[PDB]
């Protein structure tokens, strides 16, 4: 706490629980002249505001670093992990040498149906993503998979295709900010 301003809710003269939308009550409410701390009643998702940016992303010579406004209201100890990879929970491992990688690559080209990504991962104690990064399958297998996917898509009704399109649009919208 750098600043010791008095803090205020966004106060109505009326009952806020019954008349939150009534602007008139807000207009009526006068408060004594001076500086206040009105903490925002909002998530800081779309905001480029300087009171919203974290201190690590502020520059070293920024005066705003010292001021207490990027408030750490939440606590990482209390919050549980969401869609977190197994590498993040128990650390990244760089154990597999070149020979092992070469063997994996050989296996994958030979028989991707038998030696699938998940199986490789289980064998070598490593991620399916890493297996993918390491090794391409036989392009034939990929083509087959694409054809299967196309067949599945064709098997849809009109409605399902539209829903999938909507989902895709939503996904695109998520990454806009």
């Amino acid at each position: 706490k750098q600043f010791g301003f008095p803090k205020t809710q966004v106060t109505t003269i009326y009952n806020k629980t019954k008349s939150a939308s009534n602007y008139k009550g807000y207009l009526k409410h006068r408060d004594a002249p001076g500086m206040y701390y009105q903490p925002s009643e909002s998530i800081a998702t779309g905001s480029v505001n300087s009171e919203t940016i974290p201190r690590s992303f502020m520059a070293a010579s920024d005066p705003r670093r010292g001021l207490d406004m990027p408030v750490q209201s939440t606590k990482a100890k209390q919050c549980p992990n969401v869609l977190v990879g197994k590498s993040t929970v128990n650390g990244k491992t760089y154990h597999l040498g070149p020979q092992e990688i070469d063997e994996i690559r050989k296996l994958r080209l030979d028989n991707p149906q038998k030696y699938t990504r998940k199986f490789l991962a289980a064998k070598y104690g490593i991620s399916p993503l890493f297996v993918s990064m390491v090794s391409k399958p036989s392009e034939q297998h990929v083509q087959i998979m694409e054809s299967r996917l196309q067949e599945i898509q064709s098997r849809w009704k009109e409605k399902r295709r539209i829903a999938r399109e909507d989902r895709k649009r939503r996904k695109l919208l998520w990454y806009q900010a």
Binding site: Q9, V10, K16, T17, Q38, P39, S40, E41, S42, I43, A44, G46, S47, N49, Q176
Partner: protein, 138 residues
């Protein structure tokens, strides 16, 4: 990975340099036609010169046509007001001209109660959220 979305800027006339909305006014009259008397008198009588001296960013065209006397303004946004000044005296014509020069060119429009400010800017405080409110509901 990051990609741009092609987007264009919005001009706020006032904030940097104010470009005056009224760009051109056309005084139209008739030599015949008794409805154009006050317009003719205005054109004659040293008021137009004074006006032009006052407002050198507006150009003042003076045209002759057979019909009723006309005051057509021309604004920065591209819209055109045209006021017919038929049978108006000199002073009424001058008032009409003043009204025209005052106008920002935009179309006339019904406003609802307290529809005062028109912002392009995102809210300084955020938008309210029930999870992030100060007083939690019950």
């Amino acid at each position: 990975v990051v990609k741009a979305i092609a987007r264009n800027s919005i001009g706020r006339n006032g904030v940097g340099a104010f470009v005056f909305p009224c760009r051109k006014i056309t005084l139209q009259f008739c030599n015949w036609g008794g409805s154009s008397e006050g317009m003719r008198k205005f054109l004659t009588s040293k008021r137009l010169d004074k006006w032009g001296q006052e407002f050198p960013w507006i150009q003042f065209e003076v045209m002759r046509k057979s019909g009723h006397p006309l005051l057509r303004a021309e604004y920065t946004n591209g819209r055109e007001k045209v006021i017919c000044v038929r049978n108006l005296n000199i002073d009424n014509v001058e008032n009409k001209l003043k009204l025209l020069k005052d106008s920002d060119g935009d179309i006339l429009r019904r406003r609802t109660k307290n529809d005062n400010v028109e912002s392009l800017n995102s809210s300084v405080r955020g938008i309210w959220s029930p999870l992030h409110a100060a007083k939690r509901h019950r």
